[PDB]
Amino acid sequence: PFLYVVGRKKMMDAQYKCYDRMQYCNRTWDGWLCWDDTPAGVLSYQFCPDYFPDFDPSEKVTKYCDVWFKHPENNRTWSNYTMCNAFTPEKLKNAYVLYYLAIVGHSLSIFTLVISLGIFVFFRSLGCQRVTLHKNMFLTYILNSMIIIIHLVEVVPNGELVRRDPVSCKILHFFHQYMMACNYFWMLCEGIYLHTLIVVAVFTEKQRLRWYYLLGWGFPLVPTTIHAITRAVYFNDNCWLSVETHLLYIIHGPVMAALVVNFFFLLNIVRVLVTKMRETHEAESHMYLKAVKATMILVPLLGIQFVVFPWRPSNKMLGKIYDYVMHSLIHFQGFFVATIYCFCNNEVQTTVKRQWAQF
Amino acid sequence: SIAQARKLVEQLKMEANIDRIKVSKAAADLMAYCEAHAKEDPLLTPVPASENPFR
Amino acid sequence: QVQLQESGGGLVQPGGSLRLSCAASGFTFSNYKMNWVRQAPGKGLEWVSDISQSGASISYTGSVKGRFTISRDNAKNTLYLQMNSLKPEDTAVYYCARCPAPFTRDCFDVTSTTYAYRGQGTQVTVSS
Amino acid sequence: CGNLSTCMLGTYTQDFNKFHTFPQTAIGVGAP
Amino acid sequence: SELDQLRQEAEQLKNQIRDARKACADATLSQITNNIDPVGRIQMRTRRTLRGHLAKIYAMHWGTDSRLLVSASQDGKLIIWDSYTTNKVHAIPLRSSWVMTCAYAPSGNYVACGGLDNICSIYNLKTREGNVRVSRELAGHTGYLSCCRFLDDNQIVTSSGDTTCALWDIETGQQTTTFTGHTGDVMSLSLAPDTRLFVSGACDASAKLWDVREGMCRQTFTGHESDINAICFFPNGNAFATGSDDATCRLFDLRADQELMTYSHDNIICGITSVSFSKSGRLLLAGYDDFNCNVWDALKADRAGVLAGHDNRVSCLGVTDDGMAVATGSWDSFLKIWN
Amino acid sequence: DQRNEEKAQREANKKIEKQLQKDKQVYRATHRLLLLGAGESGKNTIVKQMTSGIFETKFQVDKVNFHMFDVGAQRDERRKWIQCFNDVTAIIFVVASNRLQAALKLFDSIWNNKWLRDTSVILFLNKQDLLAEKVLAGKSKIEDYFPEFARYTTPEDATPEPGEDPRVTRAKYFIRDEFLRISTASGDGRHYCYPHFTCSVDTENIRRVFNDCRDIIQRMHLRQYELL
Ligand SMILES: CC(C)CCC[C@@H](C)[C@H]1CC[C@H]2[C@@H]3CC=C4C[C@@H](OC(=O)CCC(=O)O)CC[C@]4(C)[C@H]3CC[C@]12C
Ligand SMILES: CC(C)CCC[C@@H](C)[C@H]1CC[C@H]2[C@@H]3CC=C4C[C@@H](OC(=O)CCC(=O)O)CC[C@]4(C)[C@H]3CC[C@]12C
Ligand SMILES: *[C@@H]1O[C@H](CO)[C@@H](O)[C@H](O)[C@H]1NC(C)=O
């Protein structure tokens, strides 16, 4: 509905433009595309018009000139538009393998993040200022991966409900953007705190958790309401699913800036771990083995995959694998944090082996 | 240095001058105290609930 | 009762050799690290050597390294100190000392002026 | 925020929804 | 010389004492209590947990009320716990943070504590202002204080790392008698039901029975292989148990002048830090370095149960006077009441 | 009645819990240090850098509070009261540079004690002046106490003071390797040794303790995150 309105006005702009340009083939305004004089026997290739949602501007069009090509059955000018169509056999097929990857990815995250959250609340001997932030990091992963599952089953696969355009569509998108920003800004809180233990002011203790709560939960609301308001005021589309808006950078702008700082925290932290291995003169066969493993276990916590793979490639092969590797990283990120920081933690391991054997 | 060895000897002189009962008699009088106060031992037998102040 | 009795010793000529024994009783000899300490005239106690439970980890002080060899027999509860190439500066009362706690890696207080798990000591004089 | 990593899920829900909310464009007879 | 005259005079007396003890050994304790049925299985559960202390807990002593207990932690604090309600009644900031023992007077009016400061600090709880202040500091020891036990509100017996014990007069503050004879750090002491005698275990692998009124050593008990960290009196006062670093507990008899049983196991190699008997004397609860407290049958040397709730080294344990519960302190800063 | 007595314990416990939180603020914001020396080892001047059974010396470096404990009237039998310091930040060990073998035996048992396996040791090899002139005089060589010094050579990372003889440089770096040989044989990442050549005139002694304690707290945090 709203997308068709934006596409109809765009078609008028293209018609008006070559109308001024006009003022062996000739020049006539065809559907969504107007051509000019061309020699006989030429295949004019151009970008697909992006007015329709099925049409993708990545492929080229075909226009045969003889006197333009005439349809052999209707005696009307017709241009070839097959490649512009959304490939239902494969483009939808590729989406379904990513659709079931997000559900299975977030589901495996919920299971391991609820178990890991219970170990850190029940076992009070593991309670510390590092676990207190890890419990808030675990919760924002569960809530984010619960709204995504809720959003990807009721809102997304139901085109009829999106055509109906209810307010319930909007409030769920607002609860998603807020929960998605809180999930990203809490990776910054984990980074800011970890940066203070290792790099800046190692001696001082009692890092006031009130500032982490305001940054993790409180601040993400500030750019969310600014975006959610300006969305409904100027660019209102069904269930706010469209990402063509520039107003969406009100959230993903600070979100990207917050994750960039986490990338510069990983550089300072990795600079100390090598320095601490140079005051002992460890064998380089091992110094480079514990460094990559330290960097590897800090990527899911600090969300570095959003900084090292920020933009999607323009190639059909690099972009396809980019979709596969990133979706696996983003969806299984909650599962990777619960395994490394709770299951594979030696402190948690040696205690649960004590209490379970006793009880 | 040497006077402390005199204290070790004289202390042993007194410790040797004691009357020692038999082991069979000492094992019987320790068992009789166990068999007597057995029913008065809260740890030896779990009392019913609401009678122990640590419910 | 933990008792350590040092056997052997006496006066010896410079360059001679002396073998000291240590009969143990009142404790499981195999569970403890055994030590050798000495006290020179006009000087405090000085550690000499030690041997682990089984007899693998052996250590000596530098002044007697290569000349003294410590050994133990768990099946007889005895400790040996074979002394070779003796010097006149090695004149001291040699004590058979035991580490305080069994199965432990550390060994505290074996050279203190007062120590319970240490025998009476045997005299070793190196003079003409 | 299209073509971005942090804005990648929204890009997927936008594309995956266009398969059910809109019918296939007619490119056969009568098309231009 | 005469030193070897005395060094061989003592070995003939040691042979005379040893030959007199064997003459009294006609049937071991295991053969006497071989006909009684075992105690079965002792299933005790953590009833309460006390989470107030910051640093490791070194000692605890039950009050005579069997409800209030005091604990000492090396963070420089004394906390008196109400075991029933788990509410802290008093928090006492110590002068020196290194405390190694604490005691509760049988009248509930005073608590004592000592450590690396070599001073026994008596704390008056029922003051004129309703607060807690240091009532008396007992100076005179040349080593750290390892244990102390009130005889009354004016007399207290302390053990110290200077190989000597001492009975103090809190009114004057000066020592009234010194118990010399130990050749190692005296670690633990235990008072008999009557306050006429007490037994102390030291790092010389020997326990000595002392006479409080006269100040003389009466008996000496051997058999342990390493330092004695814990000692406890039998309820009737005719025997006592000891805890050593040789991973064994032993029961000695005052009238037999020798040991009667050993409480050990092949799979037990850690030291014992605390011991205590049940009200009937049938259960010997020992605390070990392996974070677990074991329950021993004092008559059959068998193991009846295990208290395995602590995460760090079990440093102390004690049964109440009524025998209802068992408080166990550990280095993990937590006290646990068992029943 | 009885509920007021119950409430009295409930509120008095809350007031105690309030002061216990303040005392937890200062207890975690301080670093406890154990100063362990030897007979005439020169550890009194270390205290001077700014009876009783234990002494106290409170100093603050870069707005960080340190608490150093000096052993007073305690016997030479240390196997019992040494367990009280299994939670300190670092043990400051002072050695005077067979007396030297006794400090090596004491350092060994401390380094391998079951309760001190996670406690780092700051090593202050004191008396560099006396070490510097006896060797340069050659009156009583060090070869008698440690015969393996003949087959020893100056290590690669030697930074001798401008104006220091090459011979005394070989002596101090050999005694330092003696303590490092013990520490590296059982160090499994739990604790580490920080040796420092200190003199009776050095004034940067408290800055060293500050810099090594910073490494200890950093290495502790890296273990909790399992990074290092
Ligand atoms: C329904 C969702 C998708 C949107 C709205 C979320 C908020 C209503 C909730 C969800 C998570 C909550 C937070 C989860 C945990 C904490 C930590 C908590 O601090 C603690 O350590 C808890 C101590 C305690 O209360 O026992 C303070 C509240 C806070 C920030 C909560 C504040 C309220 C939040 C943001
Ligand atoms: C409306 C939904 C989406 C979010 C609701 C929570 C947020 C509004 C955040 C922003 C500021 C946060 C607070 C910032 C600081 C603190 C103090 C922190 O510790 C205290 O000081 C506790 C005692 C006290 O606050 O009086 C406990 C969490 C809390 C209240 C946070 C709770 C969660 C808050 C209210
Ligand atoms: C349009 O182009 C496609 C190439 O993708 C071709 O398969 C199709 O046959 C063309 N249409 C016509 C009518 O030739």
Query: The domain that contains A67 carries what CATH number?
Result: 4.10.1240.10
Q: Residue F118 domain-assigned?
A: yes
Contact E304, E41 (CB under 8 A): yes
> Both tokens of residue E192?
């008999």
Torsion angle, alpha carbons of C27, F185, F196, F215, to 10: -110
User: CA nearest C114 in E: which residue?
Assistant: E183
- CA E138, CA E169: separation in Å to the nearest integer? 9
Q: Which of A132, A189, A213, A222 to mutate to test the pocket of ligand 2 (most atoms within 8 A of CB)?
A: A213
Q: Which residues of F46-77 are buried (b: 16+ CB within 10 A; e: fewer)?
A: beebeeebbeebeeeeeebebbbbbbebbbeb
Helices A249-278 and A284-302: angle between axes, nearest 10 degrees: 160
Helices (H), B1-55: 3-16, 23-36
Whether the Cβ atoms of residue F195 and residue F125 lie closer than 8 Å to each other: yes
- Under 8 Å between Cβ of E189 and E274: no
Q: What is the enclosing helix (H) or strand (E) of E21?
A: helix E3-23
Region for A350 from its dihedrals, namely left if φ exceeds 0, alpha if ψ lies in -120 to 50, beta otherwise = alpha
Closest Cα partner for E25 from C27, C25, B25? B25
Ligand 3: centre distance to CA A12 (Å) = 27
Q: How far apart are CA C92 and CA C85, in angstroms?
A: 15
Atom of ligand 2 nearest to the CA of A210: 15
Q: How far apart are CA A109 and CA F109, in angstroms?
A: 48
A130 in contact with F at a CB cutoff of 8 Å?
yes
- Residue D22 belongs to what H/E stretch? none
Tell me if chain F has a CB within 8 Å of the CB of E203. Answer: yes
Find out whether the beta carbon of A175 lies less than 6 Å from any atom of ligand 2.
no
| Ligand closest in space to the Cα of A148 | 1
Say if CB A176 and CB A224 are below 8 A apart.
no
E77: contact with F, CB 8 A cutoff: yes
The Cα E241–Cα E207 span in angstroms is 10
In a domain, A17, yes or no: no
The DSSP bridge pattern shows strands E293-297 and E326-330 to be unpaired
Same domain, A259 and A350: yes
- Scanning every residue of chain A, which has its alpha carbon at the shortest distance from the alpha carbon of D16? A95
How many domains in chain C? 1
Distance separating alpha carbons of residues F207 and F50, to the nearest angstrom: 11
Q: Which of A58, A86, A114 corresponds to the end of one domain?
A: A86
Asked if C72 contacts F130 with a C-beta cutoff of 8 angstroms, the reply is: no
Q: How distant is the Cα of E100 from the closest Cα of chain B, in angstroms?
A: 28
Contacts of C119 (CB under 8 A, 6+ apart): C3, C4, C5, C6, C22, C95, C96, C97
The residue whose CA is least distant from atom 5 of ligand 3 is A83
- Whether E117 and chain A come into contact, CB under 8 Å, resolves to no
C-alpha distances out from residue F207 to A44, F66, F90, F131, Å: 78, 12, 14, 23
For residues A47 and A12, what is the distance between their CA atoms, to the nearest angstrom?
17
Cα C24–Cα C30–Cα C34 angle in degrees, nearest 5: 60
Q: For strand C10-12 and strand C122-126, is the pairing parallel, antiparallel, or unpaired? A: parallel
Q: How far is A344 from chain E (nearest CA, A)?
A: 20
What is the spatial distance between Cα A222 and Cα F54, in angstroms, rounded to a whole number? 57
Bin C10: left if φ > 0, else alpha if -120 < ψ < 50, else beta: left
Answer yes or no: do F74 and E144 touch at CB < 8 A.
yes
Contact (Cβ atoms closer than 8 angstroms) between residue F174 and residue F97: no
Q: Are E121 and E114 in contact (CB under 8 A)?
A: yes
Sequence-separated (6 or more) residues with CB below 8 Å from residue C71: C51, C55, C79, C80, C82
**Structure-determination technique:** cryo-EM
Q: Is there a contact between C116 and C26 (Cβ–Cβ < 8 Å)?
A: no
Residue positions counted in chain E: 339
Q: Tell me if residue E45 falls in helix, strand or coil.
A: coil
Instruction: Say how far apart CA C3 and CA C116 lie, in whole Å.
Output: 9
Q: Is A179 in the pocket of ligand 1 (CB under 6 A)?
A: yes
Give the list of residues 6+ apart from residue F75 with CB closer than 8 angstroms, or none. Answer: C112, C114, E142, E143, E161, E162, E163, E185
- Asked whether A174 lines ligand 1 (CB < 6 A), one says no
Burial A129-141 (b: 16+ CB within 10 A, else e): ebbebbebbbbbb
Chain length of chain B: 55
SS3 assignment, position E14: helix
Q: Residue F187: closest CA among chain A residues belongs to which residue? A: A280
Residues comprising chain C, all counted: 128
C55 at the E interface (CB within 8 A)? no
Q: Please give the resolution of this entry in Å, rounded to 1 decimal.
A: 2.7
Q: Are E229 and E246 in contact (CB under 8 A)?
A: no
Closest-CA residue to A22 (of A33, A36, A11): A36
Q: Pick B27's closest partner by Cβ from E33, E83, E281.
A: E33
Q: Which domain holds residue E236?
A: 2-338
A181/A156 same-domain check: yes
**Closest CA relative to residue F209, chosen from F14, F67, F71, F85:** F67
* Exposure on the CB side of residue A71, measured as CA atoms within 13 A: 14
> How far is the alpha carbon of F129 from chain C, nearest alpha carbon, in Å?
24
Residues of chain A that touch chain E, judged by Cβ-Cβ distance less than 8 Å: 124-125, 351, 354, 358
**Radius of gyration, CA atoms only, chain A:** 27
Distance of alpha carbon E310 from alpha carbon E330, whole angstroms: 7
The boundaries of the domain holding residue C54 are 3-126
Residue F69 pairs in a beta bridge with F34, F56
A217 lines ligand 2 (CB under 6 A): yes
C-alpha dihedral (A190, A194, A200, A204), degrees to nearest 10: 100
Q: Could you tell me if the CB of A213 is within 6 A of ligand 1?
A: yes
Q: Exposed, middle or buried, A220 (CB in 10 Å: 0-12/13-18/19+)?
A: buried
What contacts C70, CB < 8 A, 6 or more positions away?
C34, C36, C49, C50, C51, C58, C60, C79, C80, C81, C82
Which residues sit opposite C19 in a β-bridge? Answer: C82
Whether the CB-CB separation of A39 and A65 falls below 8 Å is answered with yes
Distance A219 CA to ligand 2 centre (A): 11
Residue A270 to chain F, least CA–CA distance (Å): 9
Which ligand lies nearest the alpha carbon of A129? Answer: 1
Q: Which sign does the torsion angle of CA E305, E309, E312, E313 carry?
A: negative
Side by side, the strands of the sheet bearing E87-93 are: E57-62, E68-73, E77-82, E87-93
Number of other CB atoms surrounding residue F160 within 10 Å:
15
Of E121, E83, E81, the closest CA to residue E100 belongs to E121
Half-sphere CA count of E110, side-chain side, radius 13 A = 23
A82, A119: one domain: no
Phi first, then psi: what are they for F46, rounded to 5°? -65, -40
Chains C and A touch (3+ CB pairs under 8 A): no
The yes-or-no reply on D/B contact (3 CB pairs or more, < 8 Å) is: no
Strands (E), E83-225: 87-93, 99-104, 110-115, 120-124, 133-138, 145-150, 155-160, 165-169, 175-179, 186-191, 197-202, 207-211, 217-221
Q: How far apart are CA E33 and CA C18, in angstroms?
A: 53
Partners of E51 on chain A (C-beta within 8 Å) are 124
Q: Which of C2, C46, C6, C44 is nearest to C25 (CA)?
A: C2
Q: How far is Cα E303 from Cα E285, in angstroms, rounded to an integer? A: 10
Distance of CA B20 to the CA centre of its chain: 14
Kindly report the CATH number assigned to the domain that includes residue F204: 3.40.50.300
- Chain E 248-307, CB below 8 Å of chain B: which residues? 253, 255-258, 260, 278-283, 298-299
The tokens for A302 are 């600090």
d(CA C79, CA C3): 13
Q: Are residues A179 and A311 in the same domain?
A: yes
Residue A41 lies in domain: 1-12+22-86
Specify the ligand 2 atom closest to the Cα of A219: 10
CA A101 distance to own-chain centroid: 14
- Ligand 3 pocket by C-beta < 6 Å: which residues? A 62, 80, 82-83
Separation between Cα atoms, residue E166 and residue E147, nearest integer Å: 11
Edge-to-edge strands of the sheet including C45-51?
Answer: C10-12, C122-126, C92-98, C34-39, C45-51, C58-60
A203 reaches F (C-beta below 8 A): yes
Determine whether the interchain pair E238/B12 forms a contact, defined as Cβ–Cβ distance below 8 Å: no
* Domains: count for chain A: 2
Beta carbon of A219 within 6 Å of any ligand 1 atom? no
* Partner D contacted by A27 (CB < 8 A): no
Containing C123, the helix (H) or strand (E) segment is: strand C122-126
| Nearest in space to E333 (alpha carbons), one of E22, E147, E136, E77 | E77
Residue F110 phi, psi (nearest 5)? -65, -45
**SS3 for chain F, per residue?**
CHHHHHHHHHHHHHHHHHHHHHHHHHHHCEEEEEEECCCCCCHHHHHHCCCCCEEEEEEEECCEEEEEEEECCCCCCCCCHHHHHCCCCEEEEEEECCHHHHHHHHHHHHHCCCCCCCCEEEEEEECHHHHHHHHHHCCCCCCCCCHHHCCCCCCCCCCCCCCCCHHHHHHHHHHHHHHHHHHCCCCCCCCCEEEEECCCCCCCHHHHHHHHHHHHHHHHHHHHCCCC
Token pair for residue C113?
Answer: 């002026």
Residue A96 lies in a domain: yes
Read off the CATH number of the domain in which E27 is found. Answer: 2.130.10.10
Say if B32 is an interface residue toward chain E (CB within 8 Å): no
Residues β-bridged to residue A108: none
Neighbours of A244 (CB within 10 A): 13
* Contacts (Cβ under 8 Å, ≥6 apart) of A89: none
In total, how many domains does chain F have? 1
Dist CA E326 CA C98 (whole Å)? 36
Q: Which residues of F touch A197 (CB under 8 A)?
A: 218, 221, 225
Query: C92: how many CB neighbours lie within 10 A of its CB?
Result: 20
Integer Cα distance of F222 and C24 in angstroms: 48
Beta bridge partners, C38, equal: C46, C94
Count how many pairs of residues, chain A against chain E, have C-beta atoms within 8 Å.
8
How many alpha carbons fall within 13 Å on the CB side of residue A126? 27
Cα dihedral: F96, F98, F104, F107 (round 10): -70
- Cα dihedral C54, C58, C60, C64, rounded to 10, equals 90
CA atoms within 13 A on the CB side of A37: 3
Which chain E residue has the Cα nearest residue B40? E280
Find the helix or strand (DSSP H, E) in which C47 lies: strand C45-51
In chain E, how many domains are there?
A: 1
Residue with tokens 């814990």: E230
With CB atoms and an 8 Å threshold, state whether E219 touches B27: no
Q: Rounded to whole angstroms, what are the CA distances from F129 to C126, F132, F206?
A: 36, 5, 19
Q: Cβ of E90 under 8 Å from any chain B Cβ?
A: no
Is the CB of residue A222 below 6 angstroms from any atom belonging to ligand 2? no
Residues 6+ apart with CB under 8 A from A194: A265, A269, A298, A301, A302, F225
Between CA F98 and CA F132 the distance in angstroms is 19
The three-class DSSP label of residue E201 is strand
Interchain CB distance below 8 Å, E309 and A358: yes
Q: Is A217 in the pocket of ligand 1 (CB under 6 A)?
A: yes
Rounded to the nearest 5°, which phi and psi values hold at E138?
-100, 105
- Where are the domains positioned within chain B? 1-55
